[PDB]
Amino acid sequence: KKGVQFDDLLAINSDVMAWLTVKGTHIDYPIVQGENNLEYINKSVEGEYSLSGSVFLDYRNKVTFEDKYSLIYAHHMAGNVMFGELPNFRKKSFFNKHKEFSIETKTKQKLKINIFACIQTDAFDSLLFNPIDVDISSKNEFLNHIKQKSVQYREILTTNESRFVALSTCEDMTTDGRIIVIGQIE
Ligand SMILES: [Cl-]
Ligand SMILES: [Cl-]
Ligand SMILES: [Zn+2]
Ligand SMILES: [Zn+2]
Ligand SMILES: [Zn+2]
Ligand SMILES: [Zn+2]
Ligand SMILES: [Zn+2]
Ligand SMILES: [Zn+2]
Ligand SMILES: [Zn+2]
Ligand SMILES: [Zn+2]
């Protein structure tokens, strides 16, 4: 719970930079950003060694969620431990029922994200694991790339100023499989 832990985590590890909540799941966690994307494989939010590691914002993103595309990722262990419910978004009824997640930043800014796709892709997706590549792609290539890999999708109003947030980890039942749940910042 955020009220007991967030400030203290923030005080303990300057890598701590947001809190993530996804209604309909037990995803309700502090988020770190590392200096690279391997740092939190075997490191906890408190900054110590860990067998499961942590969920992390891509090192190339702005902590303020100002970028076009903010990628929140978990490696294999942390994904199984913390993001085990993401594949529920593959289910029609689940996807139609749970439509948002929210983030609170370290300056206590509150963001609401509107979910529009659940994606099945793999570790070698040419677009979605690089926020820089996304930033320099057109909105239409981004949305069509996503569309063709989506198991669930919904059309929502977008502008060219729209920002996106993706949550992702592995899906160990398919080859090099990755799941992505993506939304648009309210
Ligand atoms: Cl990857
Ligand atoms: Cl874009
Ligand atoms: Zn940093
Ligand atoms: Zn539910
Ligand atoms: Zn660090
Ligand atoms: Zn990994
Ligand atoms: Zn895995
Ligand atoms: Zn607060
Ligand atoms: Zn593509
Ligand atoms: Zn709205």
From TrEMBL:
> Magnesium as a keyword?
no
Provide the binding site for Zn(2+) 6.
H145
Q: Superkingdom of this entry's organism?
A: Bacteria
Identify the residues that bind Zn(2+) 4. H98
Active-site residues, Swiss-Prot/TrEMBL: H75 (proton donor/acceptor), C170 (acyl-thioester intermediate)
* Record: residues binding Zn(2+) 7: E186
Q: Which GO terms describe its molecular function?
A: hydrolase activity; metal ion binding
- In this chain's numbering, which residues are marked as the site (Transition state stabilizer)? R178
Q: Which residues form the signal peptide?
A: none
Q: What is this protein called?
A: Sortase B
Q: List the source organism.
A: Streptococcus pyogenes serotype M1
Q: Which part of the full protein does this chain span, and how long is the full protein? A: 52 to 237 of 237
